[PDB]
Amino acid sequence: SDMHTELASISQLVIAKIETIDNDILNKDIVNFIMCRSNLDNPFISFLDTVYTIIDQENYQTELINSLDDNEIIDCIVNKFMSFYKDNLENIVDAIITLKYIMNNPDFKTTYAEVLGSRIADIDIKQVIRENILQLSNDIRER
Amino acid sequence: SDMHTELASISQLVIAKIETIDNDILNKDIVNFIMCRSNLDNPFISFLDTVYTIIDQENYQTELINSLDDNEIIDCIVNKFMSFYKDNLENIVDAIITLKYIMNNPDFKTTYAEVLGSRIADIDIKQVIRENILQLSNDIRER
């Protein structure tokens, strides 16, 4: 409801600050987010967090994941992770959130935490983020 | 020894024929290769196969993999697969071969065959291949 002015305003803050941010640090903040530790100081994280919040009215993801067996998880993981090396921001964001919802599972958390850590360390998404953030903002405000 | 004239000659055939090839089919041939079914009619496969052969004098990969537990495999898989969405051909080729060596493990084969199938279906590497093949040829001839 009030999340309109919210999201647009943070977008604007993101694009303004993205370049300046070291990528290694960005990737650390992102991991942390997946692990349910949101450093809101980082605007993009703040962006993510807001978005998550909106989605978790749905809540469906949690139930979904709790059903998945291991092959399904692995498929999910590998499928989602590809977003990062491609150039669609929506799917990147979606991926990240999907990954948090996974790490909210205590079993999957234990198993796959480490690797997510390792593999996120190797992505580079600053371009995608500056280039798409404001458009994404709208796609969702309106969604 | 005679693999010099071999590899250079097939490279040349690859670049000549790559564009023409439908990507969905290419990806099918590649999967099949990972599963130890080399359609040599496809020049790139032939390329792969040759390369594999060279490497399997080493043979080390097999022993290596047989040691890996599941997290390690998963890490390997996800790490390697990223090559596909990036633009280094060497690492792509290396990845593919690494994946075959995995599918030579009967246990890992059973578990992960399906997903490799699914996920390879979504890559697109024709650009990378035309743009790099001849250079790669040399890097290896000389290696």
Author numbering:
A (entry chain B), B (entry chain B): 18 to 160
From the study:
Crystallization trials of full-length VACV A49 yielded just two crystals in a single crystallization condition after 4 months of equilibration. Diffraction data were recorded to 3.0 Å resolution (full-length A49) but, because A49 does not share identifiable sequence similarity with any proteins of known structure, it was not possible to solve the structure by molecular replacement, and repeated attempts to reproduce these crystals were unsuccessful, frustrating attempts to solve the structure by experimental methods. The structure of full-length A49 closely resembles that of the truncated protein, superposing on A49 Δ12 with 0.50–0.67 Å root mean square deviation across 140 Cα atoms. In the full-length structure, residues 1–17 could not be modeled due to a lack of interpretable electron density N-terminal to residue 18. It is possible that these amino acids were removed by serendipitous in-drop proteolysis prior to crystallization. The only other significant difference between the structures of full-length and Δ12 A49 is the conformation of the region linking helices α2 and α3, helix α3 being one turn shorter in the full-length structure. In four of the eight molecules of A49 Δ12 grown in the ammonium sulfate condition and both molecules of A49 Δ12 grown in the sodium malonate condition, a single residue (Gly) of the C-terminal purification tag is observed; in the structure of full-length A49, the final two residues (161 and 162) and the purification tag were not ordered and could not be modeled. Visual inspection of the structures of A49 Δ12 and full-length A49 showed that, in all cases, two molecules of A49 self-associate via an interaction of helices α4 and α6 (the “4-6 face”). In the structure of full-length A49 this interaction is formed by crystallographic 2-fold symmetry, whereas in the structures of A49 Δ12 the interaction is formed by pseudo-2-fold non-crystallographic symmetry. Whereas the self-association is predominantly hydrophobic in nature, in the structure of full-length A49 a symmetric salt bridge is formed at the periphery of the binding surface between the side chains of Arg136 and Asp92.
VACV protein A49 prevents translocation of NF-κB to the nucleus by sequestering cellular β-TrCP, a protein required for the degradation of the inhibitor of κB. Unexpectedly, the structure showed that A49 possesses a Bcl-2-like fold despite not sharing sequence identity with known cellular or poxvirus Bcl-2 family proteins. Strikingly, despite a lack of sequence conservation with known family members, A49 adopts the Bcl-2 family protein fold comprising five α-helices wrapped around a central helix, α5 (45). The A49 structure shows that A49 lacks a surface groove compatible with binding BH3 peptides and is unable to bind the proapoptotic proteins Bax or Bak.
